[PDB]
Design a protein around this ligand. Structure first.
Ligand code: CLA
Ligand code: CLA
Ligand code: CLA
Ligand code: CLA
Ligand code: CLA
Ligand code: CLA
Ligand code: CLA
Ligand SMILES: CC1=C(/C=C/C(C)=C/C=C/C(C)=C/C=C/C=C(C)/C=C/C=C(C)/C=C/C2=C(C)CCCC2(C)C)C(C)(C)CCC1
Ligand SMILES: CC1=C(/C=C/C(C)=C/C=C/C(C)=C/C=C/C=C(C)/C=C/C=C(C)/C=C/C2=C(C)CCCC2(C)C)C(C)(C)CCC1
Ligand SMILES: CC1=C(C/C=C(\C)CCC[C@H](C)CCC[C@H](C)CCCC(C)C)C(=O)c2ccccc2C1=O
Ligand SMILES: CC1=C(C/C=C(\C)CCC[C@H](C)CCC[C@H](C)CCCC(C)C)C(=O)c2ccccc2C1=O
Ligand code: SF4
Ligand code: SF4
Lengths: 734, 107, 107, 80, 141, 107, 67, 33
C-alpha cells in the first residue's frame, strides 16, 4: 500500500518529517481513513480488533488472578476478611531503599507488596474461589480464553472464514443472539454459578468441578422448577445471623427475594443475586426472540422505524430511513453503544457503592472509593466518546439525502435551539450554583454562617421518603405504612430494604442536605456543559455559518486559518477536546462529593460535611487540605511510610497536569521556530554533523498538540486524584 | 499593626476591621507607609493631611500640565530628540537635586 | 514545597474565615478561580466560541432582541491576552492572599 | 501536497494571488464574472497552507479554498 | 515564454548569517533569486540581517520558496524592480518558478490553464458519505 | 547569528532545567524510595554554594580591612555575631546558604 | 429585458453556505451577461465574519422577498 | 527459586523487552521497501 511505517497511509509515509511517526501511531486504528479500504475490509479489521481486545481483557484478568494467586494473601484474606489487607501483587523495584522495603511490607507478606484497592479479593471471595489454586485455575482458563480470542481473530482474517460485509450488517440476528445468549444465557449461567457454587461457598461446602455433578444446590433438586413450586427455592433465607463462608446460620434457599443487605458483610444476598440474574435471564431470553432472522417470525427493525412516523408530523418523517444510517454507519453504532455503556457504567458506579454486591467490600473503604472514581471517570470518558463518535458519524457517515426530514435531520434543522437552550441551562446552573457557593463563602468569611442560602433538597429527600427512609417525616409511599406500595411489597422485600436503608451507617440513600443540593447542581452544570460542548460540536460537525464546508475537512483538522476573524479550535474534534476538560471537571466534582461525603460518613462526622459542603473553603480546607496531610507526608525528610508511592504519584500527576498546559497554552509556531534553531545547531555542532536525523524534526502538529496536552492533563488529573483518594482513604481507613 | 484602611459596616464586611491595635479597628496595611512616615519624622495626622492636599494640588498640576503640553502649547520633535539636555537635567536636577533635597529633609 | 510550604503556610488563609483576614481567605479562592477561569481562554480557540455565539445569536433573532453590534468571539490574540491576563491575576492574587494572610497571622 | 481548489463564486479581484507568499495561485481569463478573470492554482505543490488566500477572499463564504493534505518539506515551511 | 536561463551573476554584499542552506540544499532542492537593481542599496534579506544588493544583476540563493517570494514582493513593492527566481535541485535541472509566463501571476495572461478549479459553488460539494471507500475526496467530485 | 543565540540559550535552558529541577526530582525519588543518603542536601550529597558562601565570608569581614570607614558590615546577611532584634522579633540575622539555596538559586 | 431583480429590490438568500442564509438583503446590481454564474450583487446590513457586507449571488440562490 | 522469579522477569519486562521493542519498532519506523 505504502512504503514507510504508516503502511496503512501513503500520505504519512510520504512525509519527510517526524509527523509521520506520530500520525502513524495515532491514525493506526482509524480503518475508515486508510488506503485501499473497503467496507468489507473495514468490518473485518474491526472484528479481528474486537477479538484482540477480548484477548487482552482475558489476559489482564488472568494477570490479576495470577498475581493474587502467586503474590497475594488471598488464602489468609478469606479467614478474617475485614481485618486483613488485600495484596494486589508483589513489587521488585531495584531502586527501592531498605526503608521502603520495610514500609511496603504489608498484609503479612514475605516482602514488599501492593494493597489491592480494586476489590478483586471481595468479588472473587463472593463468587466462590476460596483457595489460591482456584485463582490459578481461573488464570489458566483466562489464558486459554485469550488464546481462543487470538485464534478467532486470526481465523476470521483468513479468506476461508473472512465474514462478508452483509454479515456484520445483519442487525436482527445479532440482536436476537446477543439478547438471548450473550445477555440471557450468560445471566442464566451466572445464576448457575451462584446456585451451584457461590451460595454453597457462602454456606460452607466448596462445590468445585470434581464434585458439582453429585451435590444438590437445593435438597429437592429440579422438582420445584419443573413442578412450578418455585417458592420452595425461597424456604430458608439464612436469616439475620449467617456467617459468610461458614455453615453457621446458613440456609437452603437459592433464589429468595429478600431485599437489603447481609447483616455481617453489609452486601447483597447471593440468593438475591442468583434470583436476579435468573429473572433478567428470562427477560433477555424472551426479548431475544423478537427480531426476525431466518424463521418467518419476528420484527424487522426497518419496518419498526419506518412505521414509527407520527401523524401530524410533529417529528417530521419520523424514523423513516434510520435503519440505514445505523446499519451502514459504524460511528452511529459506536456512539449509541458508548452512550449506553457510559450510562450503565455510571449506573454500575452509583449502585455498587449503595448496593454493594461483594462480601466485605463496604467495609474496606479505599476499595469503594477507587471503584466509584474508576467507573465514573470511565463513564465520563465513554460518554465523551459516544458524543465524539456521533460527531464523526455526522461528518463521515451521515447522508442527508437518504434521511430527508426524518427524526435525525430535524436535529440539524434546529441545532441552534438545542445548543442555545443547553447554553441557557448550563449558564443558569453555573451562575446560580456559583452565586450561592460564593454567597456562602462570603457568609462564612464574614462570620455569619446563619446568613447562608442553604436550599434543602426537598425533591430528593421526598424520593428517599418514597423508598422507606424515615429521616424526613414526609410519609410517602414506602415511608407510609398505610399505602399500596407498603402493602404489595411488605411481605417480600420491603422488610430487608427498610432495615437496610434506615441504617445510617451504610451508603444506601445517604442522608442528604443543602450541600448535597448545591453540589448536585454543580454536577448538573457539569453534565449540561459537557453536553453543550459535545452536542454543539456534533451538530456543527457538518458546518456552521463560520465554516459551512467543515464536513469536507474531516473530523480532526486544526483550524480554518486566521481569516474570518479567527477559526481556532473550530473542528468537532476541538469541541470534544474542550469537552474532555469539562468532563474531567464534572467527574472531579461528582467524585469529590462522593469521597468527602463518604469519608465523613466513615469517620463518623457527617455533620462536618453537612456544615462544610455549602461553601467552597470548606471543600478546600476540610477536604483537600485536611485529607491530604497523611498523603503529602508519605515521604518527609525524617522517614517515609506506605503512602510514599501515593505522594510521589500525587506530585507526578501534578507535574503532567501542568505539562499539558505547555501544549494547551503554548501553541505551535514558537516551537517550530525553536526547533529550526536546534536543527541549525545540530548541523553546525562539530562531532554531531556526523549524526543526522532521517525524520526532519518538526514541532508537534496543532491538533496533535491539543491531544497531547489533553493526554498529559487527563493523566495528571487521574493520577493526582487516584493518589489523593487512595492515600487519604488508606492512611486512616475511615 | 499598621492600619490605614477602614471598611464600612454594611453587609457584615465590618469584621475585616480587625484588632490591629491602638484603639483602632481597621485593615492592617502592608505598604510600609507608616515606616516611611517614621523615616520622615511625621508624628502628626495634620502633616499627612496637608501633604495629601499637596499631592492633590500636584495631581491637578500634572493634569493641567498634560493639557497644556498637548492642547495649548506642545513641544515639537526638536525638543524631544535632544537628549543630552534631557539626561543632564534628569541627572543633575531630577536625581541630583532630588537626592540633595531629600538629604536636606533628612538632615 | 507542597507540604512544608504550600500546605503548611496555607493554614492561616483557610483557618481564616473569621477575624479580619477573611478577605484574604476569600481572595484566595477567587484568585484560585480566575486563574482557572483564564484556562478557558488559553486552552480554547475563537472558532468554537464564535459558533456557540452564532447559536446564541439565533436564539436572540428568534425574540427580536438581535443586537446591531454583531456578537463576535474574541480575537485569537485577544483570547490569548485575556487568558494570560486572568492567569497572572489569579495566580498572583492567590499568592498575595496566601502571603498576606500567612504573614499577618504569624508575624 | 496540499489541495487548493477554487470555486466559480470567484469575482476576479486578484487579492488571493496578491496575498499568496508561494505563487500557488494565478489569475487566468474566464467568463463568469464582471472582471472576466478567475484565480487558478497550478503550483499547489508549493502551497504551505497559510490560508492568506482565503483570509483575503471577499465572497459570502469563500471561493479559493485550501484543503490541508499530505505535508511535504515544501508544505511544512522547512528551510532545512 | 522562454525562461531566463540563470547565469553565474554576482551576489549581494553580505557578511554572513545563520539563515542559509543547511541540508535542504545538500540533498534536496534549494532556490535562487535574481533581480536587476538599478543602484547599489541596502535591503533586509529574509534570512535575517541586512545585505547590500549591487548595481545591475544580483543573485541570492535561498533555502525555500517563501523566502524568495517574500524578498521578491518586498523588492517589487519597495524598490519596484523585476525579480524572478528558480529552483535548483542538487543534481542540476534548474526550474524556472515565479512568473511562469513572463508576467506576474496577478495578471490574467492567456495560455495558462484551469487546474484546481471546480465549476460549482463551495457548498454544493457532496458529503463524505458519497466519496467514502473511494480514493477521491469531497472536493474532487 | 540569532540562531546561535537562541540555540545556545535553549541548550543552557535545558541544562539548567535538568541540573536544578531534576535535582529536585532526584531528591523526591530518593526520599520516596527511602534513600535520604542519596538526596542532594546537607545531610546527603552536598552541592554547597561555595562562591556565595565565600562572598558572605568576605563581606562579613569587609569593613575591618577593605572598608575601614564602616564600623559594621553594609548588611548582616553575611555573618557575625549580629542579630538586631528590636523586640520579640529578629530583623535579619545572617542568612545561611546550604544545598537547598544552591538548588533554588539554580532554579 | 433586464434579468433578475432590480437595482433596489429587496431580496433574501436561499444559499446554504452563506453567512446571510435566510436573511434579507438589497440588490445592488444584476449583471445582464448570460454567462456570469452569480450576477445578483446583494448588499446586507450586517457584515459577515470577514467584515464584508456584500456578495454576488445566483438567481436561484435568491428569493425576491414580498416586503 | 520462586522468590527469585520477580528478579528474572521484572528486568526482562521493563528493561530487556523495552530495548527489544524499541529497537525493532525503530527499525520498522525507518524501513523502506
Ligand atoms: C448467542 C450467540 C452469540 C453470542 C454469545 C455472541 C457473543 C459475542 N459477540 Mg456476537 N454474533 C452473533 C451471536 C453471538 N455473539 C451472531 C449470530 C452474529 C452475526 C449476526 C454476531 C456478530 C458479532 C459481531 C459482528 C461482533 C460480535 C461480538 C461479540 C462479543 C461481544 C463483545 C463482548 O465481550 O461483550 C461482552 C458484553 C456483555 C456480556 C454484556 C454485559 C453488559 C451488562 C449489562 C453489564 C453489567 C453486568 C456485568 C457483566 C457484571 C460485571 C461483574 C464482574 C463479572 C466484572 C461476544 C463474544 C463482537 C466482538 O467482540 O467480536 C469478537 C463483534 O464485533 N458478534
Ligand atoms: C447454564 C446454567 C446451568 C447449568 C449448566 C446447570 C447444570 C446442572 N444443574 Mg443447575 N441450576 C441452574 C442453572 C444451571 N444448571 C439454575 C439457574 C438453577 C436455579 C433454578 C439451577 C438449579 C439446580 C438444582 C436445584 C439442581 C441443578 C442440577 C443440575 C445438574 C442436572 C441438570 C439436569 C447439572 C449439572 C441438579 C443436580 O444434580 O445438581 C448438580 C439439581 O438438583 N440445578
Ligand atoms: C468502544 C470504544 C471505542 C472505539 C472502538 C473507538 C474507535 C475509534 N475512535 Mg473513538 N473514542 C472513544 C472510544 C472508542 N473509540 C472514547 C471513549 C473517546 C473519548 C475520549 C473517543 C474519542 C475519539 C476521538 C476524539 C476520535 C476517535 C476516533 C476513533 C477512530 C480512530 C482511533 C485513532 O485514530 O486513535 C487511536 C488511538 C491511539 C493509537 C492512542 C492515542 C493516545 C491516547 C490519548 C491514549 C491511549 C476509531 C474509529 C478518531 C476518528 O474518528 O478519526 C478522525 C477521533 O478523532 N475517538
Ligand atoms: C473556573 C474556570 C471556568 C469557569 C468559571 C467556566 C465557565 C464557563 N464555561 Mg468553561 N472551561 C474551562 C474553565 C471554566 N469554565 C476550561 C478550563 C475549559 C477548557 C478549555 C473550558 C471549556 C469550555 C467550553 C468548551 C464551554 C465552556 C462553557 C462555559 C460557560 C458555562 C455556563 C456557565 O456555567 O455559565 C455561568 C457563568 C459562569 C460560571 C461565569 C462565572 C463568572 C461570574 C458569574 C460573572 C460575574 C463576575 C463579576 C461580577 C464580573 C466583574 C469583573 C470585572 C468586570 C471587573 C461558563 C462561562 C460553555 C459555554 O460558554 O456555553 C454556555 C462551553 O461551551 N467552557
Ligand atoms: C511542569 C510543567 C512543565 C514542564 C515540565 C515543562 C518543561 C519544559 N518547558 Mg514548558 N511550559 C509549561 C509547562 C512546563 N514545561 C507551561 C505551562 C507553559 C505555558 C506558557 C510553558 C511554556 C514553555 C515555553 C514557552 C518554553 C518552555 C520550555 C521548556 C523546557 C525547559 C526546561 C528543560 O528542557 O529542561 C530539562 C527538562 C525539564 C526541566 C522538564 C522536566 C523533566 C525532569 C527534569 C526529569 C526528566 C526525567 C528523565 C528524562 C526520565 C524520563 C522517563 C523515562 C521513562 C524516559 C522543558 C521542555 C522552553 C524550551 O523548550 O526551550 C528550552 C521554552 O522556550 N515551556
Ligand atoms: C496483562 C496481564 C498482566 C499484567 C499486567 C502483569 C503484570 C506484571 N507481572 Mg505478570 N503474568 C501474567 C500477566 C500479567 N502480569 C501472565 C498471564 C503470566 C503467566 C505467563 C504472568 C507471569 C509473571 C511472572 C512469572 C512474573 C510476572 C511479573 C510481573 C510484573 C513485572 C512484569 C514482568 O512480567 C513478565 C510478563 C509475563 C510473563 C507475561 C507474558 C504474557 C508486573 C506486576 C514478575 C513479577 O512478579 O514481578 C513482581 C514476574 O516475575 N508475571
Ligand atoms: C526512578 C524512578 C523509578 C523507576 C524507574 C521505577 C521503576 C520501577 N518501579 Mg517504581 N517507584 C519509585 C520510583 C521508580 N520506580 C518510587 C519513588 C516509588 C515510591 C516508593 C515507587 C513505587 C513502586 C511500586 C509500589 C511498584 C513499583 C514498580 C516498579 C517496576 C515496574 C515494573 C516494570 O517495568 O513493568 C513494566 C512497566 C510498565 C507497564 C509501565 C510503563 C508504562 C508505559 C509508559 C505505557 C505504555 C506505552 C506504550 C504502549 C509502549 C511504549 C514502549 C514500547 C517500546 C515497549 C520498575 C522497576 C512495581 C514493581 O516492581 O512491580 C513489579 C510496583 O509494584 N514502584
Ligand atoms: C451526538 C450523536 C450521537 C451520540 C449521542 C449521545 C452520546 C447521546 C447520549 C444520550 C444519553 C446518555 C442518554 C441518556 C438518557 C436517559 C434517559 C432518557 C433516562 C430515562 C429514565 C427513565 C424513563 C426512568 C424511569 C424510572 C425511574 C425514574 C427510576 C425507577 C424506574 C423507572 C423505570 C420508573 C448519536 C451516535 C446518537 C447519533 C449522532 C448524534
Ligand atoms: C512628600 C510629597 C510632597 C511634598 C514634598 C516636598 C515638600 C518637597 C520639597 C522639596 C524642596 C524644598 C526642595 C528644595 C531643593 C533645593 C535645592 C535642590 C538647592 C540647591 C542648592 C544649590 C545647588 C546651591 C548652589 C549654590 C551654593 C552651593 C551656595 C550659594 C551659591 C549657589 C546658590 C550657586 C507633595 C506635597 C509634593 C506630595 C507628594 C509627596
Ligand atoms: C512542548 C511543545 C512542543 C515541543 C514538542 C517536541 C517537538 C516533541 C516532544 C519531544 C520528545 C520527542 C519527547 C517525547 C516524550 C515521550 C517519551 C514520547 C512518548 C511517545 C511514545 C508513547 C511513542 C511542540 O512541538 C508544540 C507544538 C504545538 C503546540 C504546542 C507544543 C508544545 O507545548
Ligand atoms: C470564553 C471565550 C470566549 C468567549 C468570550 C466572550 C465573547 C468575551 C466576553 C464578553 C462579555 C461577557 C460581553 C458582555 C459585556 C458587555 C459590555 C455588556 C454589558 C451589559 C451587562 C452584561 C452588564 C472567546 O471568544 C475566546 C476566543 C479565543 C480563545 C479563547 C476564547 C474563550 O475562552
Ligand atoms: S478567489 Fe479571491 S483573489 Fe481570487 S479572484 Fe476570487 S475574490 Fe479575487
Ligand atoms: S494557503 Fe498560502 S500558499 Fe497556499 S494557496 Fe493560499 S495563500 Fe498560497
Amino acid at each position: 500500500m505504502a512504503l514507510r511505517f504508516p503502511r496503512f497511509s501513503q500520505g504519512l509515509a510520504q512525509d519527510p518529517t517526524t509527523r509521520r511517526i506520530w500520525f502513524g501511531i495515532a491514525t493506526a486504528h482509524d480503518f475508515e481513513s486508510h488506503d485501499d479500504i473497503t467496507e468489507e475490509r473495514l468490518y473485518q479489521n474491526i472484528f479481528a480488533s474486537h477479538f484482540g481486545q477480548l484477548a487482552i481483557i482475558f489476559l489482564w484478568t488472568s494477570g490479576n488472578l495470577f498475581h493474587v494467586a502467586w503474590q497475594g494473601n488471598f488464602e489468609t484474606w478469606v479467614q478474617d476478611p475485614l481485618h486483613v489487607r488485600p495484596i494486589a501483587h508483589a513489587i521488585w523495584d531495584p531502586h527501592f531503599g531498605q526503608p521502603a522495603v520495610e514500609a511496603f511490607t504489608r498484609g503479612g507478606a514475605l516482602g514488599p507488596v501492593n494493597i489491592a484497592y480494586s476489590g478483586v479479593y471481595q468479588w472473587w471471595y463472593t463468587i466462590g474461589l476460596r483457595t489460591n489454586e482456584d485463582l490459578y485455575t481461573g488464570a489458566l482458563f483466562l489464558l486459554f480464553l485469550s488464546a481462543l480470542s487470538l485464534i478467532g481473530g486470526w481465523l476470521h482474517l483468513q479468506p476461508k472464514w473472512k465474514p462478508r460485509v452483509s454479515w456484520f450488517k445483519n442487525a436482527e440476528s445479532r440482536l436476537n443472539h446477543h439478547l438471548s445468549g450473550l445477555f440471557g444465557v450468560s445471566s442464566l449461567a451466572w445464576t448457575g454459578h451462584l446456585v451451584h457454587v457461590a451460595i454453597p461457598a457462602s454456606r460452607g461446602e466448596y462445590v468445585r468441578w470434581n464434585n458439582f455433578l453429585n451435590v444438590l444446590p437445593h435438597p429437592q433438586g429440579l422438582g420445584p422448577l419443573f413442578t412450578g413450586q418455585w417458592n420452595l427455592y425461597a424456604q430458608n433465607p439464612d436469616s439475620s445471623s449467617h456467617l459468610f463462608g461458614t455453615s453457621q446460620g446458613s440456609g437452603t434457599a437459592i433464589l429468595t427475594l429478600l431485599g437489603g443487605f447481609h447483616p455481617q458483610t453489609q452486601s447483597l444476598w447471593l440468593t438475591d443475586m442468583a434470583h436476579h440474574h435468573l429473572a433478567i435471564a428470562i427477560l433477555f431470553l424472551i426479548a431475544g426472540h423478537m427480531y426476525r432472522t431466518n424463521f418467518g417470525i419476528g420484527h424487522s427493525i426497518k419496518d419498526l422505524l419506518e412505521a414509527h412516523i407520527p401523524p401530524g408530523g410533529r417529528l417530521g418523517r419520523g424514523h423513516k430511513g434510520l435503519y440505514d444510517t445505523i446499519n451502514n454507519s459504524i460511528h452511529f453504532q459506536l456512539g449509541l453503544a458508548l452512550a449506553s455503556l457510559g450510562v450503565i457504567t455510571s449506573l454500575v458506579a452509583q449502585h455498587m457503592y449503595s448496593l454493594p454486591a461483594y462480601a466485605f467490600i463496604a467495609q474496606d473503604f479505599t476499595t469503594q472509593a477507587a471503584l466509584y472514581t474508576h467507573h465514573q471517570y470511565i463513564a465520563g470518558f465513554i460518554m465523551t466518546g459516544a458524543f465524539a463518535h456521533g460527531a464523526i458519524f455526522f461528518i463521515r457517515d451521515y447522508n442527508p439525502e437518504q434521511n430527508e426530514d426524518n427524526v435525525l435531520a430535524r436535529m440539524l434543522d434546529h441545532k441552534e435551539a438545542i445548543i442555545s437552550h443547553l447554553s441557557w441551562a448550563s449558564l443558569f446552573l453555573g451562575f446560580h450554583t456559583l452565586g450561592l457557593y460564593v454567597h456562602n463563602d462570603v457568609m462564612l468569611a464574614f462570620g455569619t454562617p446563619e446568613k447562608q442560602i442553604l436550599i434543602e433538597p426537598i425533591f430528593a429527600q421526598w424520593i428517599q421518603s418514597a423508598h422507606g427512609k424515615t429521616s424526613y417525616g414526609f410519609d410517602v409511599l414506602l415511608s407510609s405504612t398505610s399505602g399500596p406500595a407498603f402493602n404489595a411489597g411488605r411481605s417480600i422485600w420491603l422488610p430487608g430494604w427498610l432495615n437496610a436503608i434506615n441504617e445510617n451507617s451504610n451508603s444506601l440513600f445517604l442522608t442528604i442536605g443543602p450541600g448535597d443540593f448545591l453540589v448536585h447542581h454543580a454536577i448538573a452544570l457539569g453534565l449540561h456543559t459537557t453536553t453543550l460542548i459535545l452536542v454543539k460540536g456534533a451538530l456543527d460537525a457538518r458546518g456552521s455559518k463560520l465554516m459551512p464546508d467543515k464536513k469536507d475537512f474531516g473530523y480532526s483538522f486544526p483550524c480554518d486559518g486566521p481569516g474570518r476573524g479567527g477559526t481556532c479550535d473550530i473542528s468537532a474534534w476541538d469541541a470534544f477536546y474542550l469537552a474532555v476538560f469539562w468532563m474531567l471537571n464534572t467527574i472531579g466534582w461528582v467524585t469529590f462529593y462522593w469521597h468527602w461525603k463518604h469519608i465523613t460518613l466513615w469517620q463518623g462526622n457527617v455533620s462536618q460535611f453537612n456544615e462544610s459542603s455549602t461553601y467552597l473553603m470548606g471543600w478546600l480546607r476540610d477536604y483537600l487540605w485536611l485529607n491530604s496531610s497523611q498523603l503529602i507526608n508519605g515521604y518527609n525528610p525524617f522517614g517515609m511510610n506506605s503512602l510514599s508511592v501515593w505522594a510521589w504519584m500525587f506530585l507526578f500527576g501534578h507535574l503532567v497536569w501542568a505539562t499539558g498546559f505547555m501544549f494547551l497554552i503554548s501553541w505551535r509556531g514558537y516551537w517550530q521556530e525553536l526547533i529550526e534553531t536546534l536543527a541549525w545547531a545540530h548541523e553546525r555542532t562539530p562531532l554531531a554533523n556526523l549524526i543526522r536525523w532521517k525524520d526532519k524534526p518538526v514541532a508537534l502538529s496543532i491538533v496533535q498538540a491539543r491531544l497531547v496536552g489533553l493526554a498529559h492533563f487527563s493523566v495528571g488529573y487521574i493520577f493526582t486524584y487516584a493518589a489523593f483518594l487512595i492515600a487519604s482513604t488508606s492512611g486512616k481507613f475511615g | 499593626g499598621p492600619s490605614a484602611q477602614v471598611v464600612w459596616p454594611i453587609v457584615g464586611q465590618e469584621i475585616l476591621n480587625g484588632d490591629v491595635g491602638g484603639g483602632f479597628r481597621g485593615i492592617q496595611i502592608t505598604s510600609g507607609f507608616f515606616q516611611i512616615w517614621r523615616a520622615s519624622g511625621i508624628t502628626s495626622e495634620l502633616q499627612l493631611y496637608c501633604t495629601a492636599i499637596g499631592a492633590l494640588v500636584f495631581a491637578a498640576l500634572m493634569l493641567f500640565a498634560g493639557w497644556f503640553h498637548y492642547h495649548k502649547a506642545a513641544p515639537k520633535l526638536a525638543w524631544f530628540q535632544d537628549v543630552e539636555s534631557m539626561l543632564n537635567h534628569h541627572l543633575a536636577g531630577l536625581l541630583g537635586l532630588g537626592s540633595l533635597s531629600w538629604a536636606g529633609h533628612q538632615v | 514545597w507542597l507540604r512544608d510550604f504550600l500546605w503548611a503556610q496555607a493554614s492561616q488563609v483557610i483557618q481564616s474565615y473569621g477575624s479580619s483576614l477573611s478577605a484574604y481567605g476569600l481572595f484566595f479562592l477567587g484568585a484560585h478561580f480566575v486563574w482557572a477561569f483564564s484556562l478557558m481562554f488559553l486552552f480554547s480557540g475563537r472558532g468554537y466560541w464564535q459558533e456557540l455565539i452564532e447559536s446564541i445569536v439565533w436564539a436572540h433573532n428568534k425574540l427580536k432582541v438581535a443586537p446591531a453590534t454583531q456578537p463576535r468571539a474574541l480575537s485569537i490574540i485577544q483570547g490569548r491576552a485575556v487568558g494570560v491576563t486572568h492567569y497572572l491575576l489569579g495566580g498572583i492574587a492567590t499568592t498575595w492572599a496566601f502571603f498576606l494572610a500567612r504573614i499577618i497571622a504569624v508575624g | 501536497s496540499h489541495s487548493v481548489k477554487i470555486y466559480d463564486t470567484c469575482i476576479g479581484c486578484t487579492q488571493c494571488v496578491r496575498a499568496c507568499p508561494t505563487d500557488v495561485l494565478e489569475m487566468i481569463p474566464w467568463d463568469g464574472c464582471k472582471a472576466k478573470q478567475i484565480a487558478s492554482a497550478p503550483r499547489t505543490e508549493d502551497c504551505v497552507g497559510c490560508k492568506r488566500c482565503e483570509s483575503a477572499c471577499p465572497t459570502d463564504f469563500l471561493s479559493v479554498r485550501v484543503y490541508l493534505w499530505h505535508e511535504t518539506t515544501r508544505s511544512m515551511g522547512l528551510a532545512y | 515564454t522562454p525562461p531566463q536561463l540563470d547565469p553565474n551573476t554576482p551576489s549581494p554584499i553580505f557578511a554572513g548569517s545563520t539563515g542559509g542552506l543547511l541540508r535542504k540544499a545538500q540533498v534536496e532542492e534549494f532556490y535562487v533569486i535574481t533581480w536587476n537593481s538599478p543602484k547599489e542599496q541596502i535591503f533586509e534579506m529574509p534570512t535575517g540581517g541586512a545585505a547590500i544588493m549591487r548595481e545591475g544583476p544580483n543573485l541570492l540563493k535561498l533555502a525555500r520558496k517563501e523566502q524568495c517570494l517574500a524578498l521578491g514582493t518586498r523588492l517589487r513593492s519597495k524598490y519596484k524592480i523585476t525579480y524572478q527566481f528558480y529552483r535548483v535541485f542538487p543534481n542540476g535541472e534548474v526550474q524556472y518558478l515565479h512568473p511562469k509566463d513572463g508576467v506576474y501571476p496577478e495578471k490574467a495572461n492567456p495560455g495558462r490553464e484551469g487546474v484546481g478549479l471546480n465549476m460549482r459553488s463551495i457548498g454544493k460539494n457532496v458529503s463524505p458519505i458519497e466519496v467514502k471507500f473511494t480514493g477521491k475526496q469531497s472536493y474532487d467530485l | 547569528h540569532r540562531d546561535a543565540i537562541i540555540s545556545h540559550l535553549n541548550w543552557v535552558c535545558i541544562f539548567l532545567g535538568f541540573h536544578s529541577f531534576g535535582l529536585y526530582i532526584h531528591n523526591d525519588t530518593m526520599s520516596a524510595l527511602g534513600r535520604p543518603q542519596d538526596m542532594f542536601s546537607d545531610t546527603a550529597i552536598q552541592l554547597q554554594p561555595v562562591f556565595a558562601q565565600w562572598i558572605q565570608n568576605t563581606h562579613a569581614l569587609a569593613p575591618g580591612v577593605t572598608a575601614p570607614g564602616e564600623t559594621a558590615s553594609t548588611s548582616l546577611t553575611w555573618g557575625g555575631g549580629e542579630l538586631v532584634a528590636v523586640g520579640g522579633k529578629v530583623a535579619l540575622l545572617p542568612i545561611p546558604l546550604g544545598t537547598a539555596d544552591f538548588l533554588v538559586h539554580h532554579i | 429585458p433586464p434579468i433578475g431583480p432590480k437595482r433596489g429590490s429587496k431580496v433574501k438568500i436561499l444559499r446554504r453556505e452563506s453567512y446571510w442564509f435566510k436573511n434579507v438583503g438589497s440588490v445592488v446590481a444584476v449583471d445582464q451577461d448570460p454567462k456570469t454564474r452569480y450576477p445578483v450583487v446583494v448588499r446586507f446590513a450586517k457584515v459577515n465574519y470577514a467584515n464584508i457586507s456584500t456578495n454576488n449571488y445566483a438567481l436561484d440562490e435568491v428569493e425576491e422577498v414580498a416586503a | 527459586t520462586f522468590n527469585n522469579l520477580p528478579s528474572i522477569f521484572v528486568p526482562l519486562v521493563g528493561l530487556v523487552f523495552p530495548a527489544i521493542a524499541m529497537a525493532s519498532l525503530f527499525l520498522h519506523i525507518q524501513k523502506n521497501k
